[PDB]
Amino acid sequence: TNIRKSHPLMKIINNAFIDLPAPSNISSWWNFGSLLGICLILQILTGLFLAMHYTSDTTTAFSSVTHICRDVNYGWVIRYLHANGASMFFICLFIHVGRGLYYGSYMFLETWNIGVVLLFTVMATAFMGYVLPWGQMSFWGATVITNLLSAIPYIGTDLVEWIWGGFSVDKATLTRFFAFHFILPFIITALAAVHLLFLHETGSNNPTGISSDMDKIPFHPYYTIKDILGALFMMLILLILVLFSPDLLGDPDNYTPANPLNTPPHIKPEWYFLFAYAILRSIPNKLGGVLALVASILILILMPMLHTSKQRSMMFRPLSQCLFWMLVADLITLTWIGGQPVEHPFIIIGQLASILYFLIILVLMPITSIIENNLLKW
Amino acid sequence: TDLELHAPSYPWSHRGLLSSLDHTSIRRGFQVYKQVCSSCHSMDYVAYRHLVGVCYTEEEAKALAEEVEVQDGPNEDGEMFMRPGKLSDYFPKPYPNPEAARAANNGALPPDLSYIVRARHGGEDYVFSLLTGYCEPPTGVSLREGLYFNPYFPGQAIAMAPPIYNEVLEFDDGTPATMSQVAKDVCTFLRWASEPEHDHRKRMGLKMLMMMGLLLPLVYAMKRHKWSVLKSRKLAYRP
Amino acid sequence: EMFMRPGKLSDYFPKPYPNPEAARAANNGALPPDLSYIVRARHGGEDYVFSLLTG
Amino acid sequence: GREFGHLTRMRHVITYSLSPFEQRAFPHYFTKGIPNVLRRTRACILRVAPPFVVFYLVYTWGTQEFEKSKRKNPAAYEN
Amino acid sequence: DPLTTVREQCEQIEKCIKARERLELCDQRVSSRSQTEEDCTEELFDFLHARDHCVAHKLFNSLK
Ligand code: HEC
Ligand code: HEM
Ligand code: HEM
Numbered sequence: 136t137n138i139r140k141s142h143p144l145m146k147i148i149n150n151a152f153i154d155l156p157a158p159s160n161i162s163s164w165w166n167f168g169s170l171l172g173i174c175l176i177l178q179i180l181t182g183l184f185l186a187m188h189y190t191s192d193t194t195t196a197f198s199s200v201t202h203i204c205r206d207v208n209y210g211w212v213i214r215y216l217h218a219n220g221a222s223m224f225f226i227c228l229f230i231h232v233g234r235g236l237y238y239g240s241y242m243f244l245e246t247w248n249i250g251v252v253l254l255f256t257v258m259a260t261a262f263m264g265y266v267l268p269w270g271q272m273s274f275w276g277a278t279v280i281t282n283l284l285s286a287i288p289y290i291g292t293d294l295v296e297w298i299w300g301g302f303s304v305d306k307a308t309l310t311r312f313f314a315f316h317f318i319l320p321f322i323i324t325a326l327a328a329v330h331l332l333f334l335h336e337t338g339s340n341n342p343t344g345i346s347s348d349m350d351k352i353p354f355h356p357y358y359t360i361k362d363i364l365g366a367l368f369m370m371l372i373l374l375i376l377v378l379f380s381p382d383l384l385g386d387p388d389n390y391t392p393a394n395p396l397n398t399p400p401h402i403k404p405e406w407y408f409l410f411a412y413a414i415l416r417s418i419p420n421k422l423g424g425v426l427a428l429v430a431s432i433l434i435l436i437l438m439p440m441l442h443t444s445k446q447r448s449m450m451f452r453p454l455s456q457c458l459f460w461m462l463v464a465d466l467i468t469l470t471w472i473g474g475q476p477v478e479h480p481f482i483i484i485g486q487l488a489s490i491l492y493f494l495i496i497l498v499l500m501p502i503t504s505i506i507e508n509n510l511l512k513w
Numbered sequence: 514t515d516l517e518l519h520a521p522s523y524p525w526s527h528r529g530l531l532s533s534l535d536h537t538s539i540r541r542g543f544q545v546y547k548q549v550c551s552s553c554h555s556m557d558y559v560a561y562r563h564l565v566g567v568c569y570t571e572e573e574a575k576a577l578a579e580e581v582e583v584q585d586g587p588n589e590d591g592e593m594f595m596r597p598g599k600l601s602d603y604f605p606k607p608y609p610n611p612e613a614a615r616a617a618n619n620g621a622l623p624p625d626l627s628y629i630v631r632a633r634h635g636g637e638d639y640v641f642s643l644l645t646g647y648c649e650p651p652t653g654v655s656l657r658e659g660l661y662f663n664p665y666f667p668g669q670a671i672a673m674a675p676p677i678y679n680e681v682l683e684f685d686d687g688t689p690a691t692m693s694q695v696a697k698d699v700c701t702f703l704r705w706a707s708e709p710e711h712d713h714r715k716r717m718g719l720k721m722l723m724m725m726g727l728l729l730p731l732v733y734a735m736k737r738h739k740w741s742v743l744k745s746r747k748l749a750y751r752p
Numbered sequence: 753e754m755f756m757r758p759g760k761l762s763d764y765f766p767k768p769y770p771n772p773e774a775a776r777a778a779n780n781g782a783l784p785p786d787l788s789y790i791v792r793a794r795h796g797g798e799d800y801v802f803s804l805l806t807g
Numbered sequence: 808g809r810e811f812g813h814l815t816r817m818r819h820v821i822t823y824s825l826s827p828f829e830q831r832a833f834p835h836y837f838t839k840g841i842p843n844v845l846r847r848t849r850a851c852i853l854r855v856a857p858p859f860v861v862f863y864l865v866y867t868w869g870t871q872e873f874e875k876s877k878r879k880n881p882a883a884y885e886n
Numbered sequence: 887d888p889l890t891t892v893r894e895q896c897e898q899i900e901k902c903i904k905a906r907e908r909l910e911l912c913d914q915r916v917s918s919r920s921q922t923e924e925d926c927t928e929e930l931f932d933f934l935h936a937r938d939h940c941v942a943h944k945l946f947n948s949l950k
Contacts, residue, residue: 154810156810156811156814201558205709211710336809348814348815349815349817351811351814352743357739357740360735360736361736363732364732364733367729371725371729374721375718378717378718378721379530379718382631387631387632388632390628390631390632456854457854457858460854460858460859464858464862467862468862468865468866471866478873479872479873480869480873484869514880515927516877516878516927516931518931518934518935521938521939522942587770587771588771588773589770589774589777590774592770609753645889646938651926651927651930652913652916652926653920653922654925664930664934669927689950691889692889693888693889693949694950738832741832742826742827743824745824745825746822746823747822747823748820748821748822748823749820751819751821881927881928886922886923886924
């Protein structure tokens with residue numbers, strides 16, 4: 136009879152990809168999340184051909200990458216795909232997140248909360264293993280981040296030395312940071328396998344905000360092809376960036392081999408943290424400052440129950456659409472501030488962004504959603 | 514709390530997207546490095562095998578390494594003995610160790626020029642400027658006895674006793690050796706040493722566009738077919 | 753460099769020759785076995801060596 | 808347990824459709840692409856720009872002022 | 887030798903001459919005293935920028 140519906144393995148994939156009711160208006164924006172999956176398989180795969188060669192020797196580490204990006208076949212390609220294919224996995228995140236604050240996508244409490252955890256794990260693996268190319272930026276950011284968690288009144292003294300294996304970076308540290316990279320990765324994949332289990336049993340959304348069980352089309356021939364087409368469009372831009380102008384997104388200060396004898400003049404991390412580092416140094420009081428740094432990834436779980444409108448999505452809410460575009464411009468000025476020395480207006484101005492990322496979505500957005508409820512009589 | 518002098522730009526012969534490397538400038542820059550300047554840095558990562566595909570022919574290349582003889586390793590009945598030299602070995606170091614280097618040249622280490630180009634805000638252009646525009650010191654400024662005035666430095670002065678000027682060398686190819694030309698050949702050599710994958714990169718970066726740029730316009734058409742079932746329906750209501 | 757140091761707690765058991773290849777020169781082309789694992793690398797054990805000596 | 812048999816209930820409606828092989832897939836693409844963008848960009852050019860417009864001003868103000876007090880300090884470094 | 891000639895030719899423009907008058911006026915100021923804060927740290931940079939902007943264009947052409 137029909138083999139597609141009686142075999143124990145193919146029931147699972149027919150019910151999951153080939154034959155699930157799907158809406159029909161979905162914006163391309165429903166596109167990006169799959170792209171992330173493509174990135175996930177490529178960061179893992181390309182990243183094992185480096186731990187094959189690399190050597191966790193504190194006075195052997197830096198020359199290791201230097202011989203791989205010279206010595207072996209095609210290694211110059213793979214090094215750069217690994218360094219650039221996560222400048223874009225971090226591109227994907229800010230779009231897949233910001234959309235869910237447009238099309239009312241948090242009312243999925245279960246889906247939404249197994250999210251933020253993944254945000255935290257992915258954001259920490261990259262720092263935890265950008266300090267083991269073993270260069271001055273790598274050591275001198277490690278020292279600075281390390282000295283903050285040590286300002287806990289009774290916590291700090293003891294925890295700090297357990298990760299060093301001593302007093303300062305030696306053979307006892309590079310080894311256990313290289314311990315870290317291997318395992319955060321595998322664990323993360325299992326949290327992504329559970330994000331979707333929730334997704335079955337509520338079905339997807341649609342960019343109007345009205346349940347449409349009336350007209351659901353399949354997810355074979357349509358979503359399968361749209362997806363393949365856009366995916367083979369991510370491999371144009373990725374490869375053009377890497378094989379035309381690789382050196383564009385980096386810094387020329389992981390080339391002098393690590394020394395305690397020098398100290399970099401204008402230390403600053405890559406672009407995609409300078410946002411959760413501009414709050415930090417914006418304020419005095421080190422113990423407090425660490426707390427305001429994590430107020431942010433936990434600002435988010437606090438925003439399903441501040442909703443105060445009667446409708447879903449901003450499509451039919453033309454007055455709230457103003458406040459959503461002063462959020463992203465805030466996050467752009469706040470990234471222009473950070474990677475730059477301290478001068479007269481930088482302190483005064485970066486301050487406003489810190490005050491406002493909070494006044495927009497803490498006071499304003501729940502109090503400006505009633506002024507318009509009062510206008511359509513709900 | 515001071516100023517700095519950002520280097521200008523030049524129409525470099527390799528500056529384009531689809532350009533190449535002049536493979537006669539690097540050959541002539543190698544002799545300049547060796548005779549003139551090859552004392553103060555290491556050049557460790559560059560062996561003697563890396564110039565045969567770039568600058569010299571193999572039977573023309575082996576005779577360069579022979580002239581500089583170096584100590585060899587321990588063995589039985591004559592450990593640490595002298596030996597002519599082989600192709601593989603790395604460029605012979607000038608100095609024993611950090612302390613002698615500090616002592617001989619005012620306690621300041623000379624950087625080893627293997628990543629000296631990539632690790633400078635700027636690049637080949639800044640390198641070309643720093644080796645031309647020297648000037649006498651202004652009025653009313655104090656300076657160290659061993660220090661010489663240079664306007665391209667963050668400290669505005671560096672221990673570099675001018676090593677490059679007219680007719681310090683002789684170009685065997687039959688070239689009137691002017692300071693500008695020798696500096697240019699040196700810079701073209703140095704960047705290539707800092708990143709040799711330039712020439713093998715811009716060719717796959719070209720056989721990627723032509724092939725892709727015609728397959729991708731296909732997928733679109735198969736798409737349209739499928740989605741063209743659903744954009745042609747009329748939807749009337751009759752209670 | 754190549755000068756002599758009195759020695760401290762860290763330093764290893766000083767090795768006799770410049771290289772092991774000197775051993776065949778003086779010892780008839782018979783390289784002496786190392787004595788770190790000679791116990792475990794033999795059938796017998798710590799009673800093969802003893803019975804070798806008085807034999 | 809929410810497949811294509813059991814969902815919402817609807818009644819008295821009708822829809823029509825052709826095949827793909829009896830039609831062409833480019834009905835005046837050139838002469839209908841432009842007017843749609845013309846009519847829609849106007850509506851939301853006003854809803855994405857003005858929030859973003861007040862960052863150019865502050866960025867240029869700060870940049871030029873800092874450039875002054877870095878390249879022209881010897882103006883107020885009075886002798 | 888070509889570079890000295892082209893530097894001479896590129897000195898005669900308005901930028902370089904108005905920079906040199908400023909530089910020598912500042913040196914006239916400074917030479918009269920000894921404790922003054924002024925070196926040639928600033929106007930000399932103006933002179934170098936004014937030269938190099940124009941020098942950087944036609945220099946590479948004059949090669950063999
Ligand atoms: C007179 C011996 C000598 C000669 C010849 C010489 N160098 Fe140097 N160079 C030094 C010393 C010593 C330093 C370190 C200066 C310091 O740090 O105080 C140095 C530093 C440099 C620097 C500065 C690097 C930086 O970080 O600013 C550059 C550039 C340089 N050398 C290039 C060259 C090149 C290229 C040549 C060959 C054309 C050359 N020099 C020939 C001795 C020399
Ligand atoms: C979410 C997944 C991952 C992310 C985001 C990530 C991120 C990074 C980044 C940014 C670097 C810096 C490399 C450089 O700057 O040159 C790096 C290096 C490295 N990673 Fe990963 N990584 C991931 C997964 C892995 C995995 C799964 C492994 C091994 C199983 C791994 C092993 C390594 C090694 C050995 C290096 C050092 C090699 C080198 O620097 O060339 N990584 N990682
Ligand atoms: C490795 C990290 C992540 C991966 C691989 C991932 C992947 C996905 C996928 C495949 C979907 C369904 C497909 C789609 O909707 O287009 C999805 C949906 C969703 N994700 Fe994630 N995501 C990640 C991180 C996050 C984060 C950080 C959040 C933050 C809240 C989040 C919240 C959501 C929400 C709300 C949806 C619902 C989409 C809808 O409206 O239907 N996810 N995600």
